[PDB]
């Protein structure tokens, strides 16, 4: 039941520096798997957990 | 594989089924390293869905 949305940099161990490429910056990924009206896993299933 | 991943070059590192950092802890059999030369348009030319 924890939530993490800090959106920091995933230091890959490549170097202790602030950057994007080779740093895996940005914890979430923009390429959401929406594949509109096709494929499998096109974002069906709205979830409610009680 | 820690030196291979965290290299001075090897700008393309398309690792699947395992993280680059987890791989250097796993043990396998019959590991194959294939090698070849291609033109510059290499991007997404090696994907399983390619």
UniProtKB/Swiss-Prot annotation, chain B:
Domain of life: Viruses
UniProt-annotated stretches for the region Integrin-binding motif: 39-41
Effect in UniProt of substituting residue 12 to A: In strain: Omicron/BA.2, Omicron/BA.2.12.1, Omicron/BA.4, Omicron/BA.5, Omicron/BQ.1.1, Omicron/XBB.1.5, Omicron/EG.5.1
Subunit organization: Binds to host ACE2. RBD also interacts with the N-linked glycan on 'Asn-90' of ACE2. Cleavage of S generates a polybasic C-terminal sequence on S1 that binds to host Neuropilin-1 (NRP1) and Neuropilin-2 (NRP2) receptors. Interacts with host integrin alpha-5/beta-1 (ITGA5:ITGB1) and with ACE2 in complex with integrin alpha-5/beta-1 (ITGA5:ITGB1). May interact via cytoplasmic c-terminus with M protein. May interact (via N-terminus) with host bilirubin and biliverdin, thereby preventing antibody binding to the SARS-CoV-2 spike NTD via an allosteric mechanism.
Function, as annotated: Attaches the virion to the cell membrane by interacting with host receptor, initiating the infection. The major receptor is host ACE2. When S2/S2' has been cleaved, binding to the receptor triggers direct fusion at the cell membrane. When S2/S2' has not been cleaved, binding to the receptor results in internalization of the virus by endocytosis using host TFRC and GRM2 and leading to fusion of the virion membrane with the host endosomal membrane. Alternatively, may use NRP1/NRP2 and integrin as entry receptors.
Protein known as: Spike protein S1
Organism: Severe acute respiratory syndrome coronavirus 2 (2019-nCoV)
Full-protein residues shown: 365 to 414 of 1273
């Amino acid at each position: 039941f924890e939530r993490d949305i800090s959106t920091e940099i995933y230091q890959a161990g490549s170097t202790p520096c602030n950057g994007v490429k080779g740093f895996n910056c940005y914890f979430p990924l923009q390429p959401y798997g929406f594949q509109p009206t096709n494929g499998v896993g096109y974002q069906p299933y709205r979830v409610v957990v009680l | 594989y820690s030196v291979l991943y965290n290299s001075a070059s090897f700008s393309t590192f398309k690792c699947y089924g395992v993280s680059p950092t987890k791989l250097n802890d796993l043990c396998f059999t019959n590991v194959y390293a294939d090698s070849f030369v291609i033109r510059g348009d290499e991007v997404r030319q090696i994907a399983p869905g390619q």
